[PDB]
């Protein structure tokens, strides 16, 4: 992966056109997104008052 919607990600020597690529992503509050492939999730209820 070199560029995502006109955003520089890595340093490559040959560019091309955008291509559909299935990949997961998540936001943490920064500008750009973070894509990941190997991740372990855990669902906790905690009986919070927000639910």
């Amino acid at each position: 992966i070199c560029k995502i919607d006109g955003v520089v990600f890595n340093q490559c020597e040959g560019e091309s056109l955008p291509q559909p690529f299935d990949v997961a992503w998540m936001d943490v509050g920064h500008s750009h997104k973070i894509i990941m492939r190997e991740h372990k999730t855990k669902w906790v209820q905690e009986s919070s008052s927000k639910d």
Binding site: E38, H39, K40, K42
Partner: protein, 505 residues
């Protein structure tokens, strides 16, 4: 260069016509056989037409005779890693009441896992159990459903090419040149067709040479680093785990990616062992440094010395000491070919101006012949003892060929003819004799050895005592007188020495 071992098996076997107005040919089909030749020779195939006086030839060039094997199968084995994940979803429904998979549900993907990718590959999605309570993540004393998916990856992308074989039949290279002008090369096998090029189906024959340490060997090679090795490899898809033969795929394009549709794995290639909602996967796939002895390019097992010969469609070779095999003849087949014949040959005459070489030995005696004619390559030399045919050019040039002689002083009169006109030539010169070279350290055999002339192994009385005399009676008398004088002097010296040793002790 030179040529020998003529056949002329199907002379005058054409059914042509006027030839498009002036002269042409239609077809020349038959069957012939070429005997064994030494590495670095040419086997000419001269045709004879009933109408045309002369025709062209077909030279067969052999450079190396290496010990290779056949190609039973071909596949690529990529490198794999250990990747896995897990989840800790709560039941919260009637899905994880007692058991997560009712009887056979293995597709544990609720449209959320990362398995639907092009870089993941394929694997086995299992399930596990969890605990209950405030510390376990839920609010019910009941086990939870924990699903896990494991898959292999290949970050680097090392590609290997393995080709199992258990024949190891002799083979060689052939640089064939057609009489029309096309020159190509191909690698024939011991009894296997060599992709016949417009009728010519010359094959190579062996002598059923025995082996000593060739039982389970393959030709596994590497593509990126171009590293070779010799080690017992696996068999076709039906294999056993414990040695080479890990997850394969269809082709080289399917080797960088471990996706499905071409990749085949049997069972028990990746282990999983979880303790508490972790699902950590350990590696059990053996690397390259886990197989048996795993010989490399430098191999000296027995008399065979396996090397890496730079060649197409094959990178495995090897050459033991001089074997001097019995027969290595070929089998040339004909299906269809034509050659343009002019039938307009005119007067031509040549002569001999140089003669040199060895005795009846490996390289032979090279004799250069000079000719002059108006056509391009209308010539055919025939003489007693040996027959040699070659090609010339238009005009006057120099051409060097080699012949086989069985006499020290080569002084005879051969007949030379270029097409239809014939003439006479003569040879006069001095030749030498060279024996079979010996073995020396630092030098190893490259391809093979065919044969060495070791029949006579005796000095001929005619050639000997020739340069010492030249007159012969005078020389013999002088040598005898000198020998007698030297013998008398040495006897007198010995008598004086014995007299000095006896007395004055």
């Amino acid at each position: 260069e030179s040529c020998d071992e003529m056949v002329h098996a199907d002379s005058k076997l054409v059914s042509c016509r006027q030839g498009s107005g002036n002269m042409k040919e239609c077809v020349t089909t038959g069957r012939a056989l070429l005997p064994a030749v030494n590495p670095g020779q040419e086997a000419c195939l001269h045709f004879t037409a009933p109408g045309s006086p002369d025709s062209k030839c077909l030279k067969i060039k052999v450079k190396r005779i290496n010990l290779k094997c056949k190609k039973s199968s071909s596949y690529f084995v990529p490198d794999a890693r250990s990747r896995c994940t897990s989840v800790r979803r709560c039941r919260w429904a009637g899905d994880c009441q007692s058991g997560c998979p009712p009887h056979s549900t293995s597709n544990s993907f609720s449209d959320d896992w990362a398995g639907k990718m092009d870089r993941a590959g394929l694997g086995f999605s299992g399930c596990s159990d969890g605990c209950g309570g405030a510390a376990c993540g839920c609010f019910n004393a009941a086990p939870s459903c924990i699903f896990w998916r494991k898959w292999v990856e290949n970050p680097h992308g090392i590609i290997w090419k393995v080709s199992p074989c258990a024949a190891w039949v002799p083979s060689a290279v052939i640089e064939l040149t057609m009489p029309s002008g096309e020159v190509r090369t191909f690698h024939p096998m011991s009894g296997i067709p060599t992709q016949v090029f417009k009728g010519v189906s010359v094959t190579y024959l062996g002598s059923d040479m025995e082996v000593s340490g060739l039982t389970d060997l393959c030709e596994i090679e590497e593509l990126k680093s171009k590293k070779l090795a010799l080690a017992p490899c696996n068999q076709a898809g039906m294999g056993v785990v414990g040695k080479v033969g890990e997850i394969q795929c269809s082709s080289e394009e399917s080797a960088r990616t471990i996706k499905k549709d071409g990749c085949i794995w049997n069972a028990d290639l990746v282990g999983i062992e979880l303790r508490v909602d972790d699902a950590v996967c350990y590696s059990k796939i053996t690397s390259v440094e886990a197989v048996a002895n795993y010989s490399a390019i430098p191999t000296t097992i027995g008399g065979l010395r396996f090397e890496r010969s730079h060649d197409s469609l094959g990178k495995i070779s090897g050459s033991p000491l001089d074997i001097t095999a019995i027969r290595g003849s070929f089998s040339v087949n004909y299906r269809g070919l034509r050659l343009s014949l002019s039938e307009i040959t005119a007067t031509c005459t040549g002569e001999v101006t140089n003669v040199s070489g060895c005795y009846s030995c490996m390289t032979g005696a090279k004799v250069s012949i000079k000719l002059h004619s108006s056509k391009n390559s209308t010539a055919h030399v025939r003489c007693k003892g040996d027959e040699t045919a070659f090609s010339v050019l238009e005009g006057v040039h120099s051409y060097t060929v080699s012949l086989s002689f069985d006499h020290a002083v080569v002084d005879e009169q051969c007949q030379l003819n270029c097409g239809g006109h014939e003439s006479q030539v003569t040879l006069k010169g001095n030749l030498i004799f060279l024996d079979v070279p010996k073995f020396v350290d630092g030098s190893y055999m490259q391809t093979y050895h065919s044969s060495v002339p070791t029949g006579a192994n005796i000095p001929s009385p005619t050639d000997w005592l020739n340069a010492l005399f030249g007159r012969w009676i005078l020389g013999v008398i002088g040598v005898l007188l000198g020998g007698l004088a030297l013998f008398f002097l040495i006897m007198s010296l010995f008598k004086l020495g014995t007299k000095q040793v006896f007395r004055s002790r």
